[PDB]
């Protein structure tokens, strides 16, 4: 596995090159929002971002070494975590707003247009605030997003399953070496390195939580016939009910 022989600097560079583009929403700025139109915007966006995430995941070192069924499970598990961490990254420089897209920057009072949404907005906003407080750097953001992909679904047949798991943990250990490398290069002390590594990884617990909540919320919009979900999104969402 050529990915296990990458230096830290080669890991960073590969992750940075793999970055998906920032997509536009189909927001028509001269129509009034409804609960349905706002959810429509968010799921339309999510659906187009998913196609770019599939191709990003292929570019994450070690991911293509896994079987197709394991790649499926990992992305199915983690898709909304990944979207949400992107969103919180994008929203770093916009206090009190979520930059879903450059043409879709929403504050918490706009979230209230969709029932149950404002709670989730509030969690996302507080996470963005944490990112800003920490002064999270893009190199660290791409490491975290990759860890979510590899880790989230990793615990959900002898050698076969085991050596896929081993491989994933070897890649995850490399991303840890890479994060430490970055902090060391940035001049953080040995103690600050482990403290920051910890602070960054504890955010994934909060991102997991937000995804769990958002999956419930999306399920509810689906079950109330608020918004038609694309077949891809329906499949992704249905992965969490079975």
């Amino acid at each position: 596995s050529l990915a296990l022989s990458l230096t830290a600097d080669q890991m960073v560079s590969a992750l940075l090159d793999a970055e998906p583009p920032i997509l536009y929403s189909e927001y028509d700025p001269t129509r009034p929002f409804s609960e349905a139109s706002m959810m429509g915007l968010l799921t339309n966006l999510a659906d187009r971002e998913l196609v770019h995430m599939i191709n990003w995941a292929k570019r994450v070192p070690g991911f293509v070494d896994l079987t197709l069924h394991d790649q499926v499970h990992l992305l199915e598990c983690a898709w909304l975590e990944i979207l949400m961490i992107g969103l919180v990254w994008r929203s770093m420089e916009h206090p009190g707003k979520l930059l879903f897209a450059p043409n879709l920057l929403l504050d918490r009072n706009q979230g209230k247009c969709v029932e149950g949404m404002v709670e989730i907005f509030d969690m996302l906003l507080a996470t963005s605030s944490r990112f800003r407080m920490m002064n999270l750097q893009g190199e660290e953001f791409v490491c975290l997003k990759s860890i979510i992909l590899l880790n989230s679904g990793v615990y959900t047949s002898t050698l076969k399953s085991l050596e896929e798991k081993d491989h994933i943990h070897r890649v995850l250990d490399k991303i840890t070496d890479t994060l430490i490398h970055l902090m060391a290069k940035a001049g953080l002390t040995l103690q600050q390195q482990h403290q920051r590594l910890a602070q960054l990884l504890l955010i994934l617990s909060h991102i997991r939580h937000m995804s769990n909540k958002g999956m419930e919320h999306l399920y509810s919009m689906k079950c109330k016939n608020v918004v038609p979900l694309s077949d891809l999104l329906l499949e992704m969402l249905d992965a969490h009910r079975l």
Binding site: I54, N55, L68, L75, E76, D231, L232, E235
Partner: peptide, 9 residues
């Protein structure tokens, strides 16, 4: 399954 297909591209 769509995801499965997209991953093969």
């Amino acid at each position: 399954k769509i995801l499965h297909r997209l991953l093969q591209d």
